[PDB]
Design a binder for this molecule. Structure first.
Ligand code: HEM
Ligand code: CL
Ligand code: CL
Ligand code: CL
Ligand code: ZN
Ligand code: ZN
Length: 196
């Protein structure tokens, strides 16, 4: 009955909290990697004399600098989602006590926070997808200038960039699970009200 539902809603919300934390942490790790990659890039780009290599490295550098801002915006929306979660927690625990009693505004509020969190999650996924895509384009660009012999520093850059991709992917994967939890929270939630 609702008792198992209330338990399930509660468990999902807890999972969601653990995951969100886990994601914030991975995104700070990504930011450190981006900043480290940029440092290696700008040295390589400055040291380059071959014009083809130089122009390529410059395009990748420029784009990598832009990822920093995208990541900051991602971090902020992350931290916003944690704040909405706090209010879901607080409002939720009052609904626990109140049930369906009184006017609907508290139930509405809970429901709207869940809506906003869902929207932040999508924005999050879209920003992430934009970073990943351009990061894969940079792998491609590096490959165009690693023909033949040499490029030992270019290979270090390729390697750090591939490692960044791995981390980005790990993170899109956690966010997918987060959006899935939120779906489930909405489904179990609605059922709590329907059964009421
Ligand atoms: C928007 C659709 C949702 C509806 C209709 C809904 C409905 C409810 C209801 C009726 C309760 C009271 C029962 C209980 O306390 O277990 C509740 C509690 C709660 N909800 Fe939701 N909810 C929704 C989404 C969310 C989301 C997305 C989260 C978190 C991301 C969340 C977190 C909570 C929490 C933490 C509680 C208190 C759990 C507890 O400690 O008892 N809810 N929700
Ligand atoms: Cl060169
Ligand atoms: Cl590009
Ligand atoms: Cl992918
Ligand atoms: Zn990047
Ligand atoms: Zn690019």
């Amino acid at each position: 009955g609702s008792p198992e539902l209330r338990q399930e809603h509660q468990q999902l919300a807890q999972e969601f909290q653990q995951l969100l934390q886990e994601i914030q942490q991975l995104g700070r790790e990504l930011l450190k990697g981006e900043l480290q990659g940029i440092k290696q890039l700008r040295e390589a780009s400055e040291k380059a004399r071959n014009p083809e290599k130089k122009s390529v490295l410059q395009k990748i550098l420029e784009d990598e600098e832009k990822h920093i801002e995208l990541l900051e915006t991602l971090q902020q929306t992350g931290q916003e989602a944690q704040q909405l979660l706090q209010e879901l927690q607080q409002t939720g625990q009052e609904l626990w006590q109140l049930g369906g009693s009184g006017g609907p505004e508290l139930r509405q509020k809970h429901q709207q926070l869940a809506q906003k969190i869902q929207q932040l999650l999508q924005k999050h996924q879209q920003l992430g997808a934009k970073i990943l895509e351009d990061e894969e384009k940079h792998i491609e660009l590096l490959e165009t200038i690693l023909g033949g012999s040499g490029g030992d520093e270019l290979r270090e850059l390729l390697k750090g960039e591939l490692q960044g991709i791995k981390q980005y992917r790990e993170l899109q994967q956690l966010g997918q699970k987060a959006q899935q939890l939120v779906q489930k929270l909405q489904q179990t939630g609605q059922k709590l009200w329907q059964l009421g």
